[PDB]
Each structure stands twice: as structure tokens, then as C-alpha cells.
Design a protein around this ligand. Structure first.
Ligand SMILES: *Cc1c(COP(=O)(O)O)cnc(C)c1O
Ligand SMILES: *Cc1c(COP(=O)(O)O)cnc(C)c1O
Lengths: 432, 432
């Protein structure tokens, strides 16, 4: 996928149309720049020429400050599973307020939520709550390094484990300075080599069962089988980062695969749209945090047990996104992704959607997408054009071309997405 | 302060009375142990024989599951500034729900909140939001290490900077493996020596202007003057962890001191009781996160800009805890602490309360409390007895003897606290 002047000119024109369409968002951006770096507090939300500012949303719909309406296919990078105004989440928030905020003590609600997590995730015997997936993964590494007394962590290029463990572009100088060795996702022979070299000092292997932010790239069974066998052989803890993949069945990727990680990290939708993360796993590892134990590890955090997350999360798992709901949404998402790919094939379009269940990302290539290198080698210019095209069609998804279907997406939204994809292929024929 | 058998017997009896008083909390604990390590998800909430479970609370009051009522002097370790059911916070939550949850985009609300932070904190030119003080301090270290290209961080024994940077008991194997050198809090000559040895590779000095969790121990001006002069001299970033101290005036400890840190971390009450943290500081440091810049640092995080925190936090700073409110509460807290100390002096009690403004901790010693070593050397057995005594009197504060006055504490609560302290001194005369 080589950059062309024609594609760059098309991007320039699309950015210009977006800018002309959205002068109020542009004004907001100039003001926001005065208080936050680049008017930004979450890097992924920025895109050129400037990001949209949204005024309000209900269900699957939102409206920008210029008055334009969209269907939200982004769904908060998988956290926004309930849409913008779910009545059961609202009711949980109301119940939480009636219990009381900042009670400075435990409530029964945290235990009920923990039970709901333990009931449905087959390798989580005990769990602790954090305030983000970033904290969950940090605590999983804290656990593995403290238990094993080892320092080396095996992770994968393209892997994303939060703001301090971001390997989406390889090593980053802002990452917490764990001794991380990066392998290639899905590369069996290369990873086997790394584990022979490093296994002796390996505290943990940290891996998503599908690269999420890194392109909705499913792990192959052979790759995960290697990690499970070698973690056990060398005495490293296998950590499955299921922050995104947990939604894929009642029991996440582990239920689907019949493979158990030693620790599992969770985040995003499970707190019902409230701040949330969790790390859990084997009883004998997690019991090291029992505060009554001699030599207990400490896991602090002011908002860990906050009543809003405990209430909304329990509702999310037991009242809304039940195990059957997870199966249904994943089957719905599979049919959706298949339809998009069918549209590509029918039109001889050099593009595909990868992913699992209700999660997907477009890639402008028909080569196998198996690692971060494959994702990067696909056409990035067409990817940007696709984002702006979908916006003009009233469809909002990630700038990077990822959707994550919420429970509020229905036939009308799915049809509109499919139609807009067909229109993109037609209108951009010269560039494809 | 030496352990005696008499004091241990008194602790045994107090624990037994607590247990007899609270069989329903005891039942909850046994069940909670099945899903969370030690039935716990936040280490500080555990105490022997078991912790209370709270059923509900409004204002400054709460009720445990056995039906006992208390005045909450803990105030969520300073986060619970608004009490359990503040109507202005409720209204902000309602407004947030009307805007919409998980909108997957920026709203104007994040910019308004950032402006409110920048307006009142005199050294914060630009700010970014995180989901906890733990994340804020981690991002401050990420910033300092990435900008300077250096690895060494100077922090202080007794210092607490979140779940991955906990030095309350010195080094901990679960802390993120930053190269941290620990000094003695308030030790000018010792710290000067460390900075001569380490200043060349010092990325940052990380310090609370008052040890919070570590005993409400004010920093002396000479100590902070050393840190500011030496950070500037060697090119390390001075980071003031104001997660607790920010409440002490309109502009936190920095306004009071007339000393500016290079970066400031914030947390706890500023998000209005919602999940919250922030790091901010000098424009030229923070602009490194402008996503439009060549070589921009990334700062991710799903819930950074969540509408509940943006709304409630803006309300917290502009509608409730204004700069004048901060001055008034700190003066109120000073009068309160002075009254407690007066009661000690009047009764020849070998105890004191240290702190600033509306924050205080009891120490069973009349020696100067200037460092973590002083805190640890004070009588820990009387400290535990004090906690149980206050509970029996319907007064709830931290097991470690810390209070953090909320805006809902009034004359009745303050009088009851003072009375219960006098009663403790009288009833425990044999042990004092
Ligand atoms: C979003 C995400 C995280 C981080 O969670 P925040 O709550 O820190 O965004 C970690 N891992 C994966 C796989 C994620 O997708
Ligand atoms: C509570 C606290 C933190 C951590 O904040 P969480 O939101 O991570 O509890 C960090 N620093 C200080 C000084 C604190 O008091």
C-alpha cells in the first residue's frame, strides 16, 4: 500500500469538507486548546483537522454542536455497550444515589458485583476492582512480578494494555518501565524462540485474545496454545487481557477457546458505562491480596468500590448483558461482519473487515491480517477517507475504522452502515 | 512507645465487643470472602476482626447493616467532601445523564471542567484528566522520564502516590518498577546529600506538601525550598502530589506556600465524588501531549472525559467548593484541630493531632511528628483502641486515626467528636 498524490489530495478535500461542515466544533477546539494540551484529554479522540464536539445523545444516536446527527457505531471503543441512555443503567444509578455516595466503607453491592463477575468468567475464582483497564493490567503485572520474583514481561507488538502499557506502535517512552520484550502477534516460531531465551526470568506473558485497538486481529489457536504451554513450563503467569474480548461470549474468549489464563483483566462495558476495571484469576494467586494474610499484597484505590460502578456493573451483567445476550449479540455481529465482507467481495473491493462477534475493523488489503505488521501495511490513506465518508453519511465509527456494536444498534443502523460502505466503494472506485 | 500486655488485652476486648455488636457485618464478610480476596477490593477498608458493611447514608451520616448510625469523619480519605447525598452533585449527575453516557466523543463539559481547574490552581497552565490519583501520578512520572530522558525518581519514605507508587512502608514489591530513591520527609541535610548523589539522573522529585495517608504531616518550608532549588539546579521536574492538599486553599498548598511545582497531580474530591484524577503544570511541559504536535506523547484512557466526572467536577469547583469555601473550611478545620489539641493539653494526655486545614490524624506521642519514622514510633496500640472507642461513640474515622472534614460536618458532629475524645482520655487513663 503506497501513498499516492491522488489519495493525499482526496484526504485534503475530505478534511476541508469536514471543516466547512463543522465550524462550531472548530470554535470549540480553539477554546479547548487554552486549558488542555491540543484541547484534548484522551489522545484517541483527536483527529485532523479537529475533532467533533457532541452536544447530546440518546440510545444509539448523537448530535454534534453543529446540529448534525449520527448513529454511534464506535460504542466507546467497546465500553458503550448500553448506548447513551439505557433505562436499566439509569435505574441502577438512581439506586446507587439512594444508597449514598462516598460512604468511605464497604457495601453489600461490591460483593454482589464480584459474585456476578466470578459466576460468569470461568477462570476468575476471585476478583478485585480497579478504576480502569490500565490499572487492571498494571495490577496483573504487579501480581506476577511480586509472586514470581521475576522481572521480564512478554507482550506483543500492536498489543494495547492501557495508557502505561501501550505497544500499539512498539515501545513508547511514556510506558511504565517494566522489562517488556515484544514478540510478533500470531508468530509461533518467533515467539517460541523468545520464550526459550527469556522464559527463565519471565514473570508473565500479557496478551489480548484478539488485538483490539491494534486492528481487531483474532489470535490463532496455535499461538495461544504455545503461550499456555510455555507459561506453564517456565513458571510465568499467563495473563489474558480481556478488556475488549470479554463480551464475545458469556465467559469471554476463554469460554470460547476452552483455554484458561492464570489471571484475566477486564474493563470497559462491565461497569455499565461507569469507571471500571478488574483483575482476577486463580484463587491461589488472588488470595495473596487477602489483607488478613501474613505478607499480604496491598491494592489501594479510592474509587475501586464506588457505589455507581458496583450498582451499574451488577445491572450490566445480570439484568442487561446476560450470557445469552452475549451469545445473541456476537451472532448478530458475525452476521453483520459477514454482510460487510460480502459487499466487498460482490464489488471486487480490495478491503476486508476483521474481528469477532460484535467487534470489527476495516483494513484496505485482502492479504491475511494476522499481526500488527499486516495492519500497518494495509492502506492508511483509504482508511482516513473511509472515516470522513461514513461521517458525511451520518455514521460515526473510530477514525481507525473500528466499530463495536452496542445493544442499541438495530436494523436501520446496520442497513445504513452497509449502504454507506457500498456507496464508498462506488464513489471511490478510481482510488481502489 | 512499647507494646504492653495490658494494651493487647484491651485491644482483644475491643475487637470482641465490636464483633458482638456487629454480627450482620460478620455474616457479610464470610460471604464476601468467596468472590474477593479477604472479601476486599480496597486494602485500606479491611481491619480486624472484620470491617463494617454500610447499608446507606445521607449527608454526614451513615448506617451499618446492624442498624448502628455514625457521623462520617473519614469523608472517603478526603474524596467525600460533599457528604453522601449532596443536592448540587445530584443535579450535576442528572444533567450528565441528559447529555448522554458513553458518547465516544468530546463534549464541551470536559473543556469547562479543565478551565475551572486552570482558573484556580496557580501553577496549572494546562491539565489532563485521568481516572484516579494513581493514574495521575503515573502520568506525571511518565511525563518527567520521557521529557528528561532520565530514570531516577526521588520520593520520600511514608509518601503515598497511589496503588503502584506506595511508599507508606518504604519499597513494596508491587510498586511499578520506576527507579525510586527514598529520602526522609522533612530531612534537609539527608535529602541534600541524596540530590548531590542522584541529581544528574533525576527525572523528578515526587512529594506531597503534607504526608496524607502517612499521618497528616506538614512539610516544612526549608524542606520544600530545598526541593524547588535543587530540582531547578539539576533539571529534575518537581512534582507536587496535591491529591489531598489541593483542598487546603483555593489554590491548594502552592497558593499557601508561594512555591510552584513543575507538575501538579490532583484527585479525590475534585471530581465531585466521581472517579477522578488529573495531572497538569507548566504549559511547555504539558504541550508535549498536544496530539497535533510532531512526536506527541500519548495519554489514553477510556473514562478520562466521562460525562459524570466532567459535570460533577465542574459543579464541585464552581458551585460548591469555591475558593472562599476552601478558605472557610480550612479555618473551620484549624479551629477544630486546635480544640482537640486543647482537650489533650487540658487533660495532660500524651497525644496530639497533626495536619492542616480540615485534615487531621491522631498520634499517641507528644514528640514532634515530622517524618514517617515519627509516625511509626508513636503508640500504635492506643491508635487501634481509639478507632474502636470512637465507633462505640457513633463516630467513624479511619482505623489509622485520620479525619477529613466534609462540608456536611456541623456543630453537632464536631461537639460529639470532642466529647468522645475527652471520654477516651478519661476512660483509658490507666493506659495513658
Ligand atoms: C481500553 C483497553 C485497556 C485500558 O482501559 P482504560 O480503561 O485504561 O481505557 C486495556 N486493554 C485493552 C485490551 C483495552 O482495550
Ligand atoms: C488517594 C491518593 C492518591 C491516589 O488516588 P486513587 O485515586 O489512586 O486513590 C495519590 N496520592 C495521594 C497523596 C493520595 O492521597
Amino acid at each position: 500500500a503506497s501513498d499516492t498524490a491522488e489519495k493525499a489530495q482526496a484526504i485534503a478535500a475530505a478534511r476541508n469538507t469536514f471543516a466547512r461542515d463543522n465550524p462550531v466544533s472548530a470554535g470549540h477546539h480553539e477554546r479547548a486548546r487554552r486549558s488542555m494540551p491540543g484541547g484534548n484529554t484522551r489522545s484517541i479522540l483527536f483527529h485532523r483537522p479537529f475533532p467533533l464536539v457532541i452536544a447530546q445523545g440518546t440510545g444509539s444516536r448523537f448530535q454534534d454542536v453543529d446540529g448534525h446527527a449520527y448513529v454511534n457505531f464506535l460504542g466507546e471503543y467497546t465500553a458503550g455497550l448500553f448506548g447513551h441512555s439505557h433505562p436499566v443503567i439509569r435505574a441502577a444509578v438512581e439506586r446507587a444515589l439512594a444508597v449514598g455516595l462516598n460512604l468511605s466503607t464497604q457495601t453489600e453491592n461490591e460483593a454482589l458485583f464480584a459474585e456476578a463477575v466470578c459466576d460468569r468468567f470461568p477462570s476468575i475464582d476471585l476478583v478485585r476492582f480497579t478504576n480502569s483497564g490500565t490499572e487492571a493490567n498494571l495490577m496483573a503485572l504487579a501480581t506476577a512480578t511480586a509472586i514470581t520474583g521475576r522481572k521480564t514481561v512478554l507482550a506483543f507488538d500492536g498489543g494495547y494494555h492501557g495508557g502505561l502499557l501501550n505497544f500499539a506502535s512498539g515501545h513508547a517512552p511514556t510506558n511504565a518501565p517494566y522489562h517488556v520484550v515484544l514478540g510478533v502477534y500470531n508468530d509461533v516460531e518467533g515467539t517460541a524462540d523468545l520464550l526459550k531465551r527469556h522464559g527463565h526470568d519471565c514473570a508473565a506473558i500479557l496478551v489480548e485474545p484478539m488485538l483490539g485497538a491494534g486492528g481487531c486481529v483474532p489470535a490463532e489457536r496455535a499461538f495461544l496454545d504455545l503461550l499456555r504451554a510455555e507459561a506453564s513450563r517456565c513458571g510465568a503467569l499467563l495473563i489474558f487481557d480481556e478488556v475488549m474480548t470479554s463480551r464475545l461470549s458469556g465467559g469471554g474468549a476463554q469460554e470460547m477457546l476452552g483455554i484458561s489464563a492464570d489471571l484475566t483483566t477486564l474493563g470497559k462495558y462491565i461497569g455499565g458505562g461507569m469507571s471500571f476495571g478488574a483483575f482476577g484469576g486463580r484463587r491461589d494467586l488472588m488470595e495473596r491480596f487477602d489483607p488478613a494474610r501474613d505478607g499480604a499484597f496491598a491494592h489501594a484505590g479510592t474509587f475501586n468500590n464506588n457505589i455507581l460502578t458496583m450498582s451499574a456493573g451488577h445491572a450490566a451483567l445480570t439484568q442487561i448483558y446476560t450470557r445469552q445476550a452475549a451469545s445473541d449479540l456476537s451472532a448478530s455481529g458475525d452476521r453483520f461482519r459477514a454482510n460487510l465482507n460480502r459487499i466487498a467481495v460482490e464489488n471486487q473491493a480490495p478491503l476486508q473487515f476483521t474481528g469477532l462477534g460484535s467487534l470489527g475493523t476495516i483494513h484496505f488489503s485482502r492479504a491475511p491480517i494476522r499481526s500488527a505488521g499486516d495492519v500497518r501495511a494495509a492502506d492508511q490513506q483509504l482508511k482516513e477517507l473511509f472515516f470522513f465518508h461514513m461521517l458525511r453519511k451520518g455514521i460515526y465509527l473510530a477514525p481507525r475504522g473500528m466499530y463495536a456494536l452496542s445493544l442499541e444498534i438495530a436494523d436501520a443502523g446496520r442497513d445504513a452502515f452497509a449502504e454507506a460502505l457500498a456507496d464508498f466503494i462506488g464513489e471511490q472506485r478510481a482510488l481502489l
